[PDB]
């Protein structure tokens, strides 16, 4: 079933929830003080949504670095690879050029991140839902729901890579202005407008002599950035994606497998009116019997009420003297099963007042006029 919680103090829940998990909390909040009347609390927390503001960096490429050596007043010699989009050239000559260029993904620089969760709270007959974030607690009269923060493999300034079809890697270090071959992000096509070539910081070691024929020997890095990443893939954090929403300069999705957790704090105020707002399986009938005293300022009046309790042996509550949804007095009483006589002292009202015996929002059908104070 569902457990009960005597609200002797504020209830507080503090816990960590998996981003791809929902959470349900249900409890009967029973009256502190020696009464077992109770208000239902029902909380539903939905899966985490991830929203990121980004700058699109264009496509990352794989490729193969090739080195060709040529010997024959070098100037002007055109070589058949001068039509290569990325080539570097330094009697003999040496030529690096990039071949087998293939796109492997679209990359995006994170500007700002925001984790949301939808939260629904029912407290008694009140039900309210809100999408919350760390900068916006769920607030109601009796219940607060806060996200303290999230443990995340994503960060600001990080770069996200999407494999085709949109796989995914997190990079904490992405080349921006100067890219050397072998770096993450080394070969880029931003905007698709042009081709951004990497640099080759290595040196050419010209081996020169007779008969053996010369060889150009480049001593820099020969392995592309993409290959280096795949070769040490465990150094990088992968992610999977579901329920995507690619709005060009914003990406919102739900993480489908573990990965992130957040901290949830739930606080439920002790200050609760268990009358009016709460329930009791006890059924109470009220009727006015008689009245004495005066309306308005002075001695005041006393209303006698007949009060019936069923479905329990005793019930501690308050019986009130009210008129037209204004109350003028109340008496606390422990009722016994069957009929009870309760005298309630009150003050106030006017000549047109009909004072009824009342409990919560329920009042008897009969009410009485008190006498004039003159």
């Amino acid at each position, epitope marked *: 079933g569902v457990g009960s919680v005597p609200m002797h103090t504020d209830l507080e829940l503090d816990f960590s929830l998996t981003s791809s998990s929902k959470y349900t909390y249900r409890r009967k909040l029973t009256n502190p003080l020696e009464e077992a009347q109770s208000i239902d609390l029902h909380i539903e927390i939905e899966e985490q949504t991830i929203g990121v503001d980004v700058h699109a960096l264009g496509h990352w490429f794989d*490729g193969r670095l090739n080195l060709k050596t040529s010997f024959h007043a070098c100037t002007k010699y055109e070589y058949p690879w*001068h*039509t*290569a989009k990325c080539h570097y050239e330094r009697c003999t000559a040496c030529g690096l050029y*990039l071949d087998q260029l293939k796109p492997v993904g679209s990359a995006y620089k994170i500007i700002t991140i925001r984790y949301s969760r939808r939260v629904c709270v029912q407290f008694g007959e009140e039900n309210l839902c809100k999408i919350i974030d760390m900068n916006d607690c769920f607030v109601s009269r009796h219940v607060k729901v806060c996200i303290i923060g999230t443990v995340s493999k994503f960060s600001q300034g990080d770069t996200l890579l999407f494999f085709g079809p949109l796989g995914g890697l997190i990079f904490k270090h992405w080349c921006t202005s100067t890219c050397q071959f072998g770096d993450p992000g080394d070969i880029m096509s931003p905007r698709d407008k042009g081709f951004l070539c990497p640099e080759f910081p290595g040196s050419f070691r010209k081996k020169c002599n007779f008969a053996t*024929t010369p060889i150009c020997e480049y001593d820099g890095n020969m392995v592309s950035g993409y290959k280096k990443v795949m070769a040490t893939i465990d150094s990088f954090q992968s992610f999977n994606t579901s329920t995507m929403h690619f709005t060009d300069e914003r990406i919102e999705w739900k993480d489908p497998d573990g990965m992130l957790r957040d901290h949830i704090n739930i606080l439920v105020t002790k200050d609760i009116d268990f009358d009016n707002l709460g329930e009791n399986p006890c059924k109470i009938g009220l009727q006015t019997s008689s009245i004495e005293g005066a309306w308005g300022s002075g001695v005041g009046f006393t209303l006698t009420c007949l009060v019936s309790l069923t479905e329990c042996p005793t019930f501690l509550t308050s019986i009130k003297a009210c008129d037209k949804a204004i109350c003028y007095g109340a008496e606390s009483v422990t009722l016994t099963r069957g009929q009870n006589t309760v005298k309630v002292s009150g003050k106030g009202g006017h000549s047109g007042s009909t004072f009824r015996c009342c409990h919560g929002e329920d009042c008897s059908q009969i009410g009485l006029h008190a006498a004039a104070p003159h």
Partner: antibody, heavy 113, light 107 residues
Framework: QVQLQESGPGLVKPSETLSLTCVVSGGSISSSNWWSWVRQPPGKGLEWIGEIYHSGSPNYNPSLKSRVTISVDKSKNQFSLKLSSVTAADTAVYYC??????WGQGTLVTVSS | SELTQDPAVSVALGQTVRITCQGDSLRSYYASWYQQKPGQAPVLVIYGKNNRPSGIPDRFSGSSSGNTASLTITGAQAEDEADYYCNSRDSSGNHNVFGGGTKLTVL
């Protein structure tokens, strides 16, 4: 400035070995780095045969390799081409080009019998 | 093939032409464009990224994106009625391949 002119035998019988000659005039053949052969059959498109950018070794088209031999000599100062065992599909206009910027006016070769 | 063109393209005088060439090596290499008139040797028009030889009009332009490369002719004139061949390096990096050619008719 130089002007290229390629010459051949015109008409040859099948299986007979073909031999083209591209003469460089107005300068040396070593003045330009890289020389190329390319032919086109009548009514058809261009087909790259081979090129010599390198004093070390020439590039050849896979489909035409072995059958085709290309050379560069400085004594006669001319670009050389030799096709072995010629069929009725080798009949085409053979072009000589340096750096693929400057072209000779070509020479027709027909293979019939 | 591995370097495909459209066989024939027809243009009315004054209009703008776009001749496209598509191949796997075209994203590793800049295409070369050659213009051939009937009974004449091929003539280089474009190489690299929009670099072009002297004697060639301003209306010839170079274009590349993905595995395609395009030769654009803005404000076409009658003398442009010729063959156009797309030329690039092979993916192996050892061959030079031509396209199927494109017969441009000006009206």
């Amino acid at each position: 400035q130089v002007q290229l002119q390629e010459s051949g035998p015109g008409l040859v019988k099948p299986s007979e070995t073909l031999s083209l000659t591209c003469v460089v005039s107005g300068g040396s053949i070593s003045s330009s780095n890289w020389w190329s052969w390319v032919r086109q059959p009548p009514g058809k498109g261009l087909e790259w045969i081979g090129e010599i950018y390198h004093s070390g070794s020439p590039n050849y088209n896979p489909s035409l390799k072995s059958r085709v031999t290309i050379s560069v000599d400085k004594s006669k100062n001319q670009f050389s081409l030799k096709l072995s065992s010629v069929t009725a599909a080798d009949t085409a206009v053979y072009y000589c080009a340096r750096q693929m910027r400057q072209w000779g006016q070509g020479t027709l070769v027909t293979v019939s019998s | 093939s591995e370097l495909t063109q459209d066989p024939a393209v027809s243009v009315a005088l004054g209009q703008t032409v776009r001749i496209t060439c598509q191949g796997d090596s075209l994203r590793s290499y800049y295409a070369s464009w050659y213009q051939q008139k009937p009974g004449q040797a091929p003539v280089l028009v474009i190489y690299g990224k929009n670099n072009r030889p002297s004697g060639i009009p301003d209306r010839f332009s170079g274009s590349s994106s993905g595995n395609t490369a395009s030769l654009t002719i803005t404000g076409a004139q009658a003398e442009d009625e010729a063959d156009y061949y797309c030329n690039s390096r092979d993916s192996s990096g050892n061959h030079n391949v031509f396209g199927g050619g494109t017969k441009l008719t000006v009206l």
